Design a protein around this ligand. Structure first.
Ligand SMILES: *Cc1c(COP(=O)(O)O)cnc(CCC#C)c1O
Ligand SMILES: *Cc1c(COP(=O)(O)O)cnc(CCC#C)c1O
Ligand SMILES: [Cl-]
Ligand code: NA
Ligand code: NA
Ligand code: NA
Ligand code: NA
Ligand code: NA
Ligand code: NA
Lengths: 382, 382
């Protein structure tokens, strides 16, 4: 029954906006493969639906964080190339081979362990992308000799393929020399060995700000979904990105508080004079976190304050008398210049747009728009 | 049956602890039905597994927030009584009837609309619990005349059953007279009409701090899972609750930063002298939010600082030289007196324990423990 929902709170996900943003990247980098980053459930949009729609618009390569994410894509019909960006436990190597998923090599020791765990039951090629650390300081190979040795090991085993090499920028969304230094260091390492088929270093910020002619693939994530990685990037670039997400809830009913009556846990809001309130069927278990108290939402065109504590499943809003049961409320709006933009919500949460999206929980249905056609995913009813 | 998982980051969920906490409440209130609150996926633990286990230990009644949650329980074999605590859209009334789910009545107008939407295709009884507002100030009937009229409407339709009446405390977890006042107001209203089968007002805090002899059912949520609703409640009561959750990740690999090398986005941590770091395969898309930077985690017995920005899928920790790949890291510990307790994590997040648990995302497998038996749910592969 996963195409039905029974509470009027949901995310609208505009797949046409996503496809449009993908085309912007394709057009900016016409000689590169766009390796769409759909990790973390496509940043809360739903990786299965996003990846399927992107394949219909010409995507041929995805990146995810974990093998679970890659297998989830394979099980739901994705036949594109997939790279797992995290480090797979070596004992699970045969599953990556079986499912035709490319893996990240973080170190020489990982590769040696992976080789020891290949049983021979899965005989297909293992596709490998070697990760270089050029300044991010997480896992990755830092020295050129190690990079060369890993390639030489791969060359001694017919089953192992050196498919790609990559790095990742730490500060591409802010001004400074770090990004150019990382890119030059990447080239310096990659130029000391045979070149693989895929060479990639650019996230959304990198892809929006630099050509990087040396690379032949890019890895945009957040900007596919229609968000600039930072304000600095938005200010620097001319390309228009289309926000893909709205968060909507309908007023269940309105109620009148009299002077001296409080609302919600802790009695943290008390009416001074007759005040109309609206109850919304959404709360912090949906990802509309407690810190959202004091924000404004858009109730049928009116800017209305969230008052009292946000509850697990319910949120209270102070509203004008015209507001009635069934009115639509936009809590996250699909426009950057909006008091309900993802960025404004991120500022209220003292965080970044990425986290606002990731917070949106499994309890929210996703309602996908593709042209006239509409599709609903409700994870609870799987 | 049991799912596989391919990244070493997970939640341990101790079902024995949950059953033990349920028994504490049954023993505190031996003449009451314990209506176990398993809304929001049992506060992140997994409502299907929790509810099944509680039924095996004598639970006969659950409460959830939404009809989707109730149907999810029914589809996975739960045959207990279930009350939806939120307001169902009136158009969906036949689905509640079909699935034998009790509904909350918030107002006379809702009931009239619900009645208009009953088609006759589902002929089974519709079980109703009337919600009274005694101070919480959300939806609910606040006046006695309206309460009586709603009961009189229910009495005109053979299909409709007045099964229960309830209210909810705003401030039961803090000192003050509000809770006693609400309880007396509840009794004053309920005593003006015929009494239904179920009479309930106590959440975890209410159940721990008051007998409420007038009521014949209680609605504990967070304390079933082993957490006190507040520090005040913990300080006031002698009953020991057993925490049910650990959040675990294994070190993928360690690495040495030299002086002047930075880590993660924004280069927000720079080593002053040779520093060993560990990479953990968990991040803010898992619910370990960015604000956790600067916290301590427990790496194989050693207290270790989270350094640099927490990423979507990866977290960096500063570690002693003894730490190696594969070491277990406790990020949330199943002990209240711990620097990794849920309450300490909640303080770092500037929130409450409830939200820390709700934040734990669908990407984390839940590994259930029942004695020596172990069972895994991994939503990505479901
Ligand atoms: C998430 C991520 C991206 C996309 O970043 P945004 O465009 O959303 O800012 C690109 N590359 C990697 C690989 C790093 C590794 C391993 C990501 O993790
Ligand atoms: C969540 C909730 C509970 C349980 O609260 P805790 O024990 O976890 O503090 C009890 N009752 C209601 C009904 C309110 C309504 C409608 C809950 O929503
Ligand atoms: Cl990295
Ligand atoms: Na080879
Ligand atoms: Na190129
Ligand atoms: Na709460
Ligand atoms: Na009746
Ligand atoms: Na980030
Ligand atoms: Na979350």
């Amino acid at each position: 029954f996963s195409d039905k929902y029974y509470r009027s709170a949901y995310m609208n996900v505009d797949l046409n906006a996503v496809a449009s943003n993908f085309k912007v990247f394709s057009t900016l980098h016409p000689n590169k493969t766009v390796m769409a980053v759909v990790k973390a459930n496509a940043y809360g949009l739903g990786s299965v639906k996003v990846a399927r729609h992107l394949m219909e618009n010409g995507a041929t390569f995805f990146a995810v964080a974990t093998l679970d994410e890659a297998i989830e894509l394979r099980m739901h019909g994705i036949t594109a190339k997939i790279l797992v960006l995290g480090v797979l436990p070596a004992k699970d190597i045969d599953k990556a081979i079986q499912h035709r998923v490319a893996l990240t090599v973080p170190s020489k020791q990982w590769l040696k362990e992976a080789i020891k765990n290949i049983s021979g039951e899965q005989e297909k090629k293992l596709w490998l992308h070697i990760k270089l650390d050029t300044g991010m300081g997480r896992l990755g190979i830092k020295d050129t000799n190690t990079y060369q040795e890993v390639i030489e090991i791969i060359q001694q085993y017919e089953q192992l393929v050196f498919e790609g090499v990559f790095t990742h920028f730490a500060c591409a969304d802010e001004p400074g020399d770090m990004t150019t230094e990382q890119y030059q260091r990447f080239k310096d390492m990659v130029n000391e060995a045979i070149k693989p088929e895929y060479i990639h270093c650019q996230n959304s910020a990198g892809s929006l700000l630099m050509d990087c002619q040396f690379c032949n693939a890019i890895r945009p994530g957040i900007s596919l979904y229609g968000y600039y990685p930072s304000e600095y990037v938005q200010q620097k670039v001319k390309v228009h990105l289309k926000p893909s997400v709205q968060l909507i809830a309908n007023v269940v009913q309105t109620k009148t508080l009299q002077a001296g009556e409080s609302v919600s846990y802790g009695a943290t809001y008390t009416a001074t004079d007759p005040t109309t309130i609206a109850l919304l069927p959404i709360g912090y278990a949906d990802g509309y976190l407690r810190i959202m108290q004091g924000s404004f939402v858009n109730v049928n065109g009116h800017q209305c304050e969230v008052i009292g504590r946000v509850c697990m499943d319910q949120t209270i809003v102070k509203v004008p008398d015209q507001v009635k049961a069934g009115d639509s409320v936009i809590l996250i709006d699909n426009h950057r210049e909006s008091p309900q933009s993802v960025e404004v919500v991120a500022e209220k949460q003292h965080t970044i747009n990425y986290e606002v999206l990731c917070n949106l929980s499994r309890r929210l249905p996703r309602i996908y728009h593709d042209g006239d056609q509409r599709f609903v995913t409700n994870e609870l009813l799987k």
